[PDB]
Amino acid sequence: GMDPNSMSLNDFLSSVLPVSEQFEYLSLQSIPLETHAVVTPNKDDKRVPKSTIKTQHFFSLFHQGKVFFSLEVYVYVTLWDEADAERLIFVSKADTNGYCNTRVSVRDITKIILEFILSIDPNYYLQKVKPAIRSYKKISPELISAASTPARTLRILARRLKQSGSTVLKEIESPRFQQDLYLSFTCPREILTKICLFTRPASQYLFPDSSKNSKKHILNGEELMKWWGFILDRLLIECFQNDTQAKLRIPGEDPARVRSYLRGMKYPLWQVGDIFTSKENSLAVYNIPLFPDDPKARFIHQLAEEDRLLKVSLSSFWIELQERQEFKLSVTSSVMGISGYSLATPSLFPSSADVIVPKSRKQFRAIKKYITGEEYDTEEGAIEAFTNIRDFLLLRMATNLQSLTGKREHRERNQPVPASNINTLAITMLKP
């Protein structure tokens, strides 16, 4: 809450990066938004959400003046009135552009950013929430809001000037306004946690044209699925209770094939299938979660268009999704899901060192687009991204790009590095 925290994003990362090597990182977060429910609701259903809170996390790493890695994760906190509360981490994408000169473990970087996100207290997102809709009909005097026409906006500015000598309302910053213009909620720290992920080589486009670049090794559906599996596998091991549900499925593939891939998992309880419920007789509409840029949702919206929402079951849905060329999948694309409770109660409220929260959606997008809208056929785009990121932060946010030094190696060490850093804590904290 307002009390100290020990683990920070800087720490997680350094732990996983090459010792004595510099890396810059960008951890970007949206203002938590009250939004529609994740799964399309059932007009007559078990339980209706008091509220649904959406926040995006976008990460980038740079080495020597060049961006080279990104990760897009959305976190959703769902509040029920009666039925408790749960959080869902939708892993949207993780990509590279292949312009990092020194070797790093991207698998480990990605793993560790997810552990960080897991370590975040859910309540952190519930403190101050942009409502889905603010009603200004109750507030006097007249405000300039999203729906003000430019002519009304200008007339209000004019009235304010003639009366005030200023176009600012001191009233906005007052206690009455701030409490009415945002939402607050609370929930337990230890809540059911889901992770969702769809592997498809065609999704891998954080770095446009990075394919053109010889240096980047482009993964195929199968290689890509395994890459992620390893990572989810480790999360399960290190972060969830050993009774946690772990699902994999490869649409249009038969489960015995699927099962052959789960052979490698260290984690015991991987199963073929998915973490989705069986409501309205397995009708897909009422069980499929709709995420940004996600193939699942795209298909659902096509169903809605062909009024077939009432004609497709979950079983049917996977096969149809694979059959339609417009969604891709062709090279053995897959769906992974996790459901369960973390080992540690997430206590952490990210600090200014852990995240940057741009002032609006527009500002957030502007920064992110410096990376996702750059061209990476050549190295000069990896430079352009870094240069524009560093420059924009300083110019508009009076912020410098954060730096850090890795501290990991091929461990020949005298004692386990986890039991080694703890000693240092003990001495400095218990000050002998």
Partner: protein, 236 residues
């Protein structure tokens, strides 16, 4: 009902239809010229109010989302000094111009010890390519502009050898600043400011015309609402 008369009535109609789309085309232009003329006096009135407002352009160009994409973030130091943008449509001076044709004039206030105060004008005309009924493309010729001193190392007039490996890297870097865009002509593909044409249209079709919209969105009282304007129902 003869396969021949049948085939001939259609050709006669198809011909009528083509003739008809031509009329539609001519009308589009007619309507566009119509529109442009009724706007001239109105833009003048407006731009004069705009001069009574300081920081208008700086704010507007920060409100527009795509504009940011065409330029170096570091260019905003200089974009922020723009206090005047006039677009003039050239078809209004002469019917020999496309209605998409225009000159655009910027004024930069300048920055002490870095960027000189200056007025630049740049023209954009559609040229039609032989064998290509593409409607034609937008093109321009380079306009002199004095780069900021901070951009000395990527200023084409300051770099020693464009050809050398290092010299070429630096030239391409300056080419994706707003100043590189003043040099863009559209006739040297892959060697100029990227998408100079997209940026130009951006100005002529959105930034200059709708600047007041963009300005008003920067005036919302809540930070997280600037600057916007404000799932399924499966039954029936």
């Amino acid at each position: 009902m003869s396969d021949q008369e049948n085939e001939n009535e259609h050709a006669k109609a198809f011909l009528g239809l083509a003739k008809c789309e031509e009329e539609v085309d001519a009308i589009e232009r007619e309507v566009e010229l119509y529109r442009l003329n009724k706007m001239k006096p109105v833009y003048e009135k407006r731009d004069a109010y705009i001069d009574e407002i300081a920081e208008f352009w700086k704010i507007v160009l920060s409100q527009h989302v795509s504009f940011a994409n065409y330029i170096r973030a570091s260019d905003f130091k200089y974009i922020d000094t723009i206090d005047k943008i006039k677009v003039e449509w050239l078809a209004l001076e002469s019917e020999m111009y496309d209605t998409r044709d225009f000159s655009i004039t910027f004024h930069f206030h300048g920055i002490e010890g870095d960027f000189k105060e200056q007025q630049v004008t740049k023209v954009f005309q559609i040229k039609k390519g032989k064998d290509d009924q593409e409607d034609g493309i937008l093109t321009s010729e380079p306009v002199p502009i004095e780069w900021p001193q901070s951009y000395d190392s990527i200023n084409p007039d300051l770099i020693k050898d464009k050809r050398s490996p290092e010299g070429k890297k630096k030239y391409r870097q300056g080419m994706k600043t707003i100043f590189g865009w003043f040099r863009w002509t559209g006739l040297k593909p892959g060697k100029e400011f990227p998408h100079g044409d997209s940026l130009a249209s951006l100005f002529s079709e959105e930034i200059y015309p709708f600047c007041v919209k963009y300005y008003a969105e920067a005036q919302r009282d809540l930070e997280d609402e600037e600057g916007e304007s404000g799932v399924d129902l499966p039954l029936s």
